[PDB]
Amino acid sequence: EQFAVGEIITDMAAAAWKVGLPIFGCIYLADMNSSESVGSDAPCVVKVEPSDNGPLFTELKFYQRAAKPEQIQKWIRTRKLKYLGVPKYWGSGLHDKNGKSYRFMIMDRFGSDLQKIYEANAKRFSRKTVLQLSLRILDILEYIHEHEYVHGDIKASNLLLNYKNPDQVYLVDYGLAYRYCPEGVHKAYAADPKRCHDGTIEFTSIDAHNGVAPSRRGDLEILGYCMIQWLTGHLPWEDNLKDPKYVRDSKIRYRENIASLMDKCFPAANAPGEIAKYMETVKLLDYTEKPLYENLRDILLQGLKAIGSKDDGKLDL
Ligand SMILES: C#CCN1C(=O)[C@@H](C)N(CC#C)c2nc(Nc3ccc4c(=O)[nH][nH]c4c3)ncc21
């Protein structure tokens, strides 16, 4: 009960918001202050945590730095995108309840997460779906990377559909995002003592497993594991998630021979070539290396040609 329904809160820019019903975490629907109350079709949410919470601070800094509405709209215009799946930041402030200090932030409201939809579809997405999701995710990753950040936890539960457009997917949850290149100086290949967050074990990068700070190649690697999970319903190491050593060992061995990962994950000889080629390309990245995002997108587009489709932006969920 951090907020009352109908409570009006004011952000640092003196913009007024009204809180709606609660919705993982402490999150409520929200809208611009008005006489009417906040509908079930509200266009915003408000995320609230104690002011001493580290993740919300990390997240807020990400949103302020790289997710300003104009900043995003400029990129979309320049890169000629249909949309960009980075949630827009609308504001933030402080809020007292019962004598303790809380930090809040206002973001875009979305529809369903992809994990619910994945489960509802018997833990499979079509090749078409996976390729269309992945092309959009590569747009997102390129954007955040160019703004000095990596996400480090890409997965279906952090991917939400636009409330008004089911063909547009957004990456959320920047609470453990990492500023890999502050002021254009890439972090060295070593642990960051301020970070102890390892990601989601089934999907996380070999770099994260090794205890080094996440970088761009790691985000791409994570997406790779997601693509296989979505296509097949499985990953090779999924029965041993309690043992990080095992998971790391398996990922390293599979990275060494991608063909054997394809043989393991796909029924013999049925392996989509673009997935192998994607994984081969990511494997060649150095820790500090800037990915060629267009080449990666090109690889996935060949997959769309192979199934007699095109990048029409249809997710087919
Ligand atoms: C009503 C409804 C649908 N709906 C939900 O059911 C669930 C999935 N959640 C919470 C989560 C995740 C939602 N979250 C948002 N918005 C944002 C935006 C930015 C972030 C961010 O950076 N971290 N979490 C975020 C949630 N919109 C709708 C939902």
Domain enclosing residue 164, as ranges: 111-317
Resolution (A): 2.2
Domain boundary among 60, 93, 110: 110
What 73-80 contacts at long range (C-beta under 8 Å, 24+ apart), as own/partner pairs, is: 75/143, 79/139
- Kindly report the protein residue whose alpha carbon is nearest to atom 20 of ligand 1: 172
Does residue 126 sit in the same domain as residue 78? no
Which of 247, 303, 317 has the alpha carbon at shortest distance from 131? 303
DSSP, res 182: G
Helix ranges (H only) for the chain are: 54-66, 69-78, 114-120, 127-146, 206-209, 216-232, 244-256, 258-265, 273-283, 293-306
Pull the structure tokens for residue 252.
Answer: 């390293």
Pull the structure tokens for residue 286.
Answer: 């150095």
Pairing of strands 100-108, 159-162: unpaired
Rounded Cα distance, 246 and 29, in Å: 41
Rounded Cα distance, 215 and 206, in Å: 11
Q: What is the whole-number distance in angstroms between the Cα of residue 230 and the centre of ligand 1?
A: 21
Does residue 122 sit in the same domain as residue 265? yes
Q: Is 59 helix (H, G, I), strand (E, B) or coil?
A: helix
Pull the structure tokens for residue 70.
Answer: 């104009």
Contact 283, 291 (CB under 8 A): no
The burial class, CB within 10 Å (0-12 / 13-18 / 19+), for 229 is: buried
User: Is 201 known as a binding-site position?
Assistant: no
The burial class, CB within 10 Å (0-12 / 13-18 / 19+), for 312 is: exposed
Rounded Cα distance, 307 and 209, in Å: 35
Q: What is the whole-number distance in angstroms between the Cα of residue 160 and the centre of ligand 1?
A: 7
DSSP, res 146: H
Does residue 169 sit in the same domain as residue 144? yes
Cα separations in angstroms, 215 against 152, 191, 219, 231 = 8, 12, 7, 25
- Phi and psi, residue 17, nearest 5°: -130, 150
Pull the structure tokens for residue 273.
Answer: 């070539």
Does residue 119 sit in the same domain as residue 104? no
Domain boundary among 90, 110, 130: 110
Contact 122, 301 (CB under 8 A): no
CATH code, 257: 1.10.510.10
Domain count, the chain: 2
